[PDB]
Design a protein around this ligand. Structure first.
Ligand SMILES: NC(=O)c1ccc[n+]([C@@H]2O[C@H](COP(=O)([O-])OP(=O)(O)OC[C@H]3O[C@@H](n4cnc5c(N)ncnc54)[C@H](OP(=O)(O)O)[C@@H]3O)[C@@H](O)[C@H]2O)c1
Ligand SMILES: Nc1nc(=O)c2nc(CNc3ccc(C(=O)N[C@@H](CCC(=O)O)C(=O)O)cc3)cnc2[nH]1
Ligand SMILES: [Mn+2]
Ligand SMILES: [Mn+2]
Ligand SMILES: [Mn+2]
Length: 159
């Protein structure tokens, strides 16, 4: 099973200048809980944005050019990325925009955080047909001293 996980601001913005400008510790905690002990697939730009391997996860990087760091696994195509994960129950695709576009048609589950924040971005989550997805979990949270925006955790499963 392939799943995508992402945090979306207003208008499906996911990034600006290869960064995420907001800071929501509760969402990063949700990301860690849902990805720990699973393989994570990311594109090269997202690898450079994170800046280090994510501990406790098999890190697989998509790039057309040779890898430059043997602490992670480098692959050259979508099919190779999936194969490098082996026989696991759930593969997590962690972005960015171009990678999400390629894996969306193959995904059975979306873990989405909807952040009530307006930011001027250059990267968006793919348009996804709402009729194809059933919401099986949603949990709203108001802003607090640690999290400066309200946010909604949602899990969607392909119908
Ligand atoms: N809010 C969120 O949830 C979230 C999550 C992830 C990322 N982001 C943000 O998203 C932005 C990065 O997204 P992005 O769309 O620019 O880039 P990306 O999807 O991270 O990376 C694209 C790169 O991945 C490689 N790639 C992708 N598909 C490939 C394929 N089929 N075969 C081989 N290589 C492939 C290419 O690398 P080469 O050029 O080396 O071939 C391509 O240039 C940043 O702003 C980041 O902060 C946000
Ligand atoms: N829900 C969600 N939120 C995000 O912010 C997110 N970000 C990315 C891409 N960017 C990043 C940037 C940093 C870390 C990171 O350092 N995560 C730590 C959290 C611990 C911490 O730094 O507070 C990790 O161990 O996973 C992960 C992804 C991909 N999927 C996401 N999914
Ligand atoms: Mn091929
Ligand atoms: Mn197999
Ligand atoms: Mn806000």
């Amino acid at each position: 099973m392939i799943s995508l996980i992402a945090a979306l601001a207003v208008d499906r913005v996911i990034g600006m200048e290869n960064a995420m400008p907001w800071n929501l510790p509760a969402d990063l905690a949700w990301f860690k809980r849902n990805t720990l002990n699973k393989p994570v697939i990311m594109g090269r730009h997202t690898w450079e944005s994170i800046g280090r391997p994510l501990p406790g996860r098999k890190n697989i990087i998509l790039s057309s050019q040779p890898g430059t760091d043997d602490r992670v696994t480098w692959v050259k195509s979508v099919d190779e990325a999936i194969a490098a994960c082996g026989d696991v129950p759930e593969i997590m695709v962690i972005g960015g925009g171009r990678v999400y576009e390629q894996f969306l048609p193959k995904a059975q589950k979306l873990y989405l955080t909807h952040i009530d924040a307006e930011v001027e971005g250059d990267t968006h989550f793919p348009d996804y047909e709402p009729d194809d997805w059933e919401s099986v979990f949603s949990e709203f949270h108001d802003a607090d001293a640690q999290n400066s925006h309200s946010y909604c955790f949602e899990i969607l499963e392909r119908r």
